[PDB]
Amino acid sequence: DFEEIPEAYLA
Amino acid sequence: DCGLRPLFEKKSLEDKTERELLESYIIVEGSDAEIGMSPWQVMLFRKSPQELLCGASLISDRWVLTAAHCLLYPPWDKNFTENDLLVRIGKHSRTRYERNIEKISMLEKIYIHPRYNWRENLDRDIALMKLKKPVAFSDYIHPVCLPDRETAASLLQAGYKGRVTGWGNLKEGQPSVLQVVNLPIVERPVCKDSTRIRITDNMFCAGYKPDEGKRGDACEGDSGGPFVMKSPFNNRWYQMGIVSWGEGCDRDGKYGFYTHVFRLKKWIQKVIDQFG
Ligand SMILES: N[C@@H](C(=O)N1CCC[C@H]1C(=O)NCc1cc(Cl)ccc1Cl)C(c1ccccc1)c1ccccc1
């Protein structure tokens, strides 16, 4: 149930 | 500047239980943490699927301290690398992207203690993570002090309470926000007689005796987080242990075992100065 972190970090 | 919390020490405010800790120097059954009460707390987060791996601590702007077993535990086919993970510093809520409060960092290099014993008893369960770029400190983000021989010596004594924090299991529901518990250190005898695992000098155990009436412990998800103590001499928080292993969470007659950070400080120095 984690809230979507910014894609900027996931990149 | 380590171990003096922007929102408490620096303003002369006491958090609601630190006096239990100071009065003793003569997460299961913990409570919700106050904002800014452990600004060195880090969440290790897996990118896919998105999930809480472990706790950890901020020891400088570039370096995070965690339990080696969070990264490499071959029994469970766990072997993570730099790009598998994200470090999230400044958090309170387990699941929310706390926009404008937290910072997410990418890892540059993971270092596991070369004699980490995953095969038998998680002896030297300690790993260092160098972040890609420095985290800037804030009210919610501040490092903890690693101990020196003399602070280790006078504080890590049976009966002296320490404080453990983490977003792991509440029972053997995970919490909404960071939980905290204050546990007494236990005599090595008692520690050895409660288990079948060979205990080594790089470890100590904490928890209340079944007759002490209070209770509390770390549990699954809490691994890698800090066991910290406040010095009654200079008022700073030092990290004495890393949450390593237990036999269930808060069983009577059982105790949690922590990596003894002072006993492995030489390896920590050696890695920091030789690599940044
Ligand atoms: N329950 C295992 C554990 O805590 N483990 C297995 C490896 C990861 C770690 C853990 O989840 N620690 C989180 C934890 C820490 C503490 Cl301080 C208290 C409760 C809990 Cl669950 C542990 C164990 C001890 C005795 C009998 C079976 C298993 C064990 C000790 C030594 C070597 C292997 C296993």
Question: Strand pairing of B51-58 and B85-89?
Answer: unpaired
3 state SS for chain B: CCCCCCCCHHHCCCCCCHHHHHHCCCCECCEECCCCCCCCEEEEEECCCCEEEEEEEECCCCEEEECHHHCEEHHHCEECCHHHEEEEECCCECCCCCCCCCEEECEEEEEECCCCECCCCCECCCEEEEECCCCCCCCCCCCCECCCHHHHHHHCCCCCEEEEEECCCCCCCCCCECEEEEEEECCHHHHHHCCCCCCCCCEEEECCCCCCCCCCECCCCCCCCEEEEECCCCCCEEEEEEEEECCCCCCCCCCEEEEECHHHHHHHHHHHHHHC
- Atom index in ligand 1 nearest the CA of residue B206 equals 17
Domains and CATH numbers, chain B: 27-38+144-262 (2.40.10.10), 39-143+263-274 (2.40.10.10)
Query: Which residue owns the Cα nearest ligand 1 atom 32?
Result: B121
List chain A residues with CB under 8 Å of B50.
2, 4-5
- Among B257, B265, B273, B269, CA closest to B239: B265
Of A1, A6, A10, which has the smallest distance from its Cβ to B95's Cβ?
Answer: A1
Experimental technique used to determine this entry: X-ray
CA–CA gap between residue B54 and residue B13 (Å, rounded): 29
* Resolution of the structure, angstroms: 2.3
CA–CA gap between residue B245 and residue B220 (Å, rounded): 9
Backbone angles phi, psi at B18, to 5 degrees: -70, -20
C-alpha dihedral, B209 to B215 to B221 to B223, nearest 10°: -40
CB B117 within 8 A of CB B239: no
Give me the residue label for tokens 């005599």: B187
CA-to-CA dists, residue B30 to B138, B141, B219, angstroms: 26, 22, 11
Please work out whether the CB of residue B122 comes within 6 Å of at least one atom of ligand 1: yes
Could you tell me the two tokens for B243? 């949450």
Backbone angles phi, psi at B231, to 5 degrees: -70, 130
Cβ-count burial B18-54 (b if 16+ within 10 Å, e if not): beebeebbebbbbeebbebbbbbbbbbbeeeeeebbb
CA–CA gap between residue B75 and residue B77 (Å, rounded): 6
CB B243 within 8 A of CB B67: yes
Confirm or reject contact between A3 and chain B (CB < 8 A): yes
List chain A residues with CB under 8 Å of B96.
3
CB B107 within 8 A of CB B82: yes
Partners of B206 in the beta sheet?
A: B185, B256
